[PDB]
Design a protein around this ligand. Structure first.
Ligand SMILES: [Hg+2]
Length: 347
C-alpha cells in the first residue's frame, strides 16, 4: 500500500543548484534552481567538445592530423604544460584538454583548426545551443575563462551532457580516460569520481572558480540504466565530488528505467477493412523508455485505444492511428502514438 506508492525525500545537497535526469527517458528525478542562470566556467568546454566531436563525426579532420600552434594559443615560457608557438601537436593530444584543469591554449588552437577562428567557433557553439533547444545558455569563448558574461544552468548543462553521450559517443569516451599524454607529458584526469569504486562513473566535466564555486556534471551507469547529474555552485572543497555521489546513489536506489516497447516490434494487431491484408501491425516509431519507482516493474500496465472504431485501408507506414497508455496503479504515467508498422494499400 503506502510503501508501494511512497515518494522519497530528496537528500540535502550543499550547492546553489542541481538536477538529476535519467539519460534514456529524460525524466527529472530531482531539481533545485535548475533554470537559474549561472557562470558555468570551464564546463563551457562541454559545448566545445560537442562541436569538436561533430566535426570529427563529419570527417573534417582526424586523430592523427597535425595542428600548428598559433599566437592565439600563446596569448591566452618555463612551464612544460604550455604549448610552444609554431610547434606541431597531433589532434589526439589537444582534444584531451577537456580532462585538464587548464589546457586553454590547446583549446584555442583546436578552435582555429576546426573553424578558422575563435569567433566562428563560438558561433557554432551558440548555434548548437539553439539546435538543442536550450533556453538559458550563451557562450562567448571556447574555454570559459575570460567572459563572465557567459551563462548556463544545471538543466542545460545536464542536457549538454545528454547530447554528448547520444550524438558524439566517440568524443564522449575521451572523458573516462584516467591517464593520458598531453604535450608529450603524462597527465591525470581531474574527475576524481572516475576512481570511485561504489559507482561506474565515466564522465563528464569538473570545474572551479571563486565566483562560480564547485561545478560538476557526472554520469554513471548501473546495468542498462544511466543517470546524469549537474551540480552547480557547490560550496565546499569537501563536497566537490561527495554531493554528486549522493545524488547519483539516491537515483539508483529509488528509481529504475524500463524499456517496455522497442521500435519495430509488434505491440498489437488489428483488423483492416478494404486492404491488401486483413491485419494491421501496430507499434511505435520511437523506443519507449520509462523511469519508475524501483521495484514497480511488474505493476506497470500497457493498453491502447484507436482513434476510430475500425481501420480502413489505405494505411501508410508510421501513420498514427491511436494511443498507447502506460499505467501504474491505474494512473496514466505516459502516452505514446500508436503507429502502423507496414504499408497496407487498398484492395
Ligand atoms: Hg577545449
Amino acid at each position: 500500500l503506502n510503501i508501494k506508492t511512497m515518494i522519497p525525500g530528496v537528500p540535502q545537497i550543499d550547492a546553489e543548484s542541481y538536477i538529476l535526469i535519467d539519460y534514456n527517458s529524460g525524466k527529472v528525478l530531482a531539481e533545485q534552481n535548475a533554470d537559474v542562470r549561472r557562470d558555468p566556467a570551464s564546463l563551457t568546454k562541454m559545448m566545445t567538445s560537442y562541436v569538436i566531436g561533430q566535426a570529427m563525426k563529419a570527417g573534417k579532420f582526424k586523430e592523427t592530423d597535425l595542428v600548428t600552434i598559433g599566437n592565439d594559443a600563446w596569448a591566452t615560457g618555463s612551464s612544460l604544460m604550455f604549448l610552444k608557438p609554431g610547434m606541431q601537436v597531433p589532434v589526439s593530444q589537444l582534444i584531451r584538454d577537456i580532462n585538464l584543469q587548464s589546457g586553454n591554449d590547446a583549446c584555442v588552437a583546436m578552435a582555429d583548426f576546426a573553424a578558422g577562428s575563435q569567433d566562428a567557433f563560438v558561433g557554432l557553439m551558440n548555434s548548437y545551443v539553439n539546435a538543442l533547444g536550450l533556453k538559458n545558455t550563451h557562450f562567448q569563448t571556447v574555454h570559459g575563462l575570460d567572459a563572465d558574461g557567459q551563462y548556463s544552468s544545471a538543466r542545460d548543462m545536464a542536457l549538454i551532457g545528454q547530447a554528448l553521450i547520444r550524438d558524439v559517443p566517440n568524443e564522449y569516451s575521451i572523458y573516462k580516460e584516467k591517464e593520458f599524454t598531453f604535450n608529450g607529458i603524462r597527465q591525470l584526469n581531474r574527475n576524481g569520481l572516475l576512481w570511485d569504486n561504489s559507482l561506474n562513473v565515466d564522465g563528464i566535466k569538473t570545474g572551479h572558480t571563486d565566483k562560480a564555486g564547485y561545478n560538476l556534471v557526472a554520469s554513471a551507469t548501473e546495468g542498462q540504466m544511466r543517470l546524469i547529474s549537474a551540480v552547480m555552485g557547490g560550496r565546499t572543497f569537501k563536497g566537490r565530488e561527495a554531493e554528486s555521489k549522493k545524488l547519483l546513489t539516491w537515483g539508483f536506489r529509488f528509481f529504475e528505467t524500463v524499456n517496455p516497447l522497442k521500435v519495430g516490434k509488434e505491440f498489437a494487431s488489428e483488423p483492416v477493412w478494404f486492404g491488401d491484408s486483413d491485419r494491421a501491425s501496430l507499434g511505435v516509431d520511437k523506443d519507449v523508455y520509462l523511469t519508475i519507482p524501483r521495484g514497480r516493474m511488474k505493476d506497470l500496465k500497457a493498453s491502447y485505444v484507436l482513434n476510430s472504431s475500425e481501420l480502413h485501408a489505405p494505411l501508410q507506414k508510421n501513420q498514427v492511428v491511436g494511443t498507447i497508455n502506460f499505467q501504474l496503479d491505474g494512473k496514466t504515467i505516459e502516452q505514446r502514438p500508436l503507429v502502423v508498422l507496414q504499408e497496407i494499400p487498398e484492395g
